[PDB]
């Protein structure tokens, strides 16, 4: 009956942005006061929906997208935005209806001497379509000569490491991001009363 929002927000480890996880929430009662009454979030941008009224709505499904990015890249998680994260890792539709929630996670995700486990896609010949996940690790062919799956000249690994460190500036520090997508057919997800 209780929607597993805690498993998403309070997760011990988040996924890399290139392989962002999506949680399907269905057939449960969702309490959102835990979210919008909180004081832990640095960003709670909502587009087209009112979070303070979320306890009086019925949807077909709710999606929870989780990943970790830098502080400077949080601005890219918004409709009609461009950048390495927005174009190659996680893209929001221009008609996006939902909330983008982010909070600083330097305590949990930045290690002394760096983390090197959170990754992002650096090379891609075309921008991602909205809500598309690309987990390919094929060597990026920057020239005409084939790469044969070995790094070299005009042959780059598509993924790069964030390397979060505690001593970095606020923009460089890791930020856990949860993107709430509301889909509205029978209504399986509703708030209290």
């Amino acid at each position, epitope marked *: 009956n209780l929607c597993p929002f805690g498993e998403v927000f309070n997760a011990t480890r988040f996924a890399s942005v290139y392989a962002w996880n999506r949680k399907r929430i269905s057939n449960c009662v969702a309490d959102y006061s835990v979210l919008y009454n909180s004081a832990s979030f640095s960003t709670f941008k909502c587009y087209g929906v009112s979070p303070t009224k979320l306890n009086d709505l019925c949807f077909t499904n709710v999606y929870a997208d989780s990943f970790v990015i830098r502080g*400077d890249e949080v601005r890219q998680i918004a409709p009609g935005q*461009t950048g*390495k994260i927005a174009d*190659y890792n996680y893209k929001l539709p221009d008609d996006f209806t939902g909330c983008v929630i982010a909070w600083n996670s330097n305590n949990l995700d930045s290690k002394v001497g760096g983390n090197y486990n959170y990754l992002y896609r650096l090379f891609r010949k075309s921008n991602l379509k909205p809500f598309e996940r690309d987990i390919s690790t094929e060597i990026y*062919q*920057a020239g005409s000569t084939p790469c044969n799956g070995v790094e070299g000249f005009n042959c780059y690994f598509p993924l790069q490491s964030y390397g979060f460190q505690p001593t970095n500036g606020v923009g*460089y520090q890791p930020y856990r991001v949860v993107v709430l997508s509301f889909e509205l057919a029978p209504a399986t997800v509703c708030g209290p009363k």
Partner: antibody
Amino acid sequence: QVQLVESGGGLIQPGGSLRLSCAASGFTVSSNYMSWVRQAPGKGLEWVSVIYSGGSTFYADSVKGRFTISRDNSKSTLYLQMNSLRVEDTAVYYCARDFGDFYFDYWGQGTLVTVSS
Amino acid sequence: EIVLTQSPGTLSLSPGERATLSCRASQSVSSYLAWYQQKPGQAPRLLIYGASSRATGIPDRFSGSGSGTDFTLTISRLEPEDFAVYYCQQYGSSPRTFGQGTKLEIKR
């Protein structure tokens, strides 16, 4: 081998328009980040614009709204349109191959743009 | 905007010595620095990417060091083919910025 040859530099009155061409060899233009970097006489290097492998374009504050960066895959050339030029825009504009919006591993010989009445 | 300051502004050492060039930044960039060498009438050439990684085709005598706000370029075995202007560029935060340069002069 990698080659970057530039063209289009010259004299232009303030408020005029000028386009800079940069033919590229040794790599695929469409699949790489590429940037224009200008160097005013005795001032040093300054980043101007970048075009991503996916086609996204970003510009500097001093040139935003006036400069337009573009690529022609059919002709393997990187372009830089310079509308509403100013006297302070006078610099030597370099054509550089960008490694993922981080650093410029290959540079063109550079072309000189002089803006004066 | 982040400002990179190179010290010294100019430097003149005899061939065969060690040239030490500093490069300090406004904020910490976490080793996201690059070193370039520009000979007169020529384009800049990439020497070192990252704080310490050496670009292809550059001799081992060129070495990068430092992290955060302090970086160092050390050129050992100074040969007359050297002695150009050296810039350092950061790429930790947009927009990318360069240093004012450090002219390298030969002494005779």
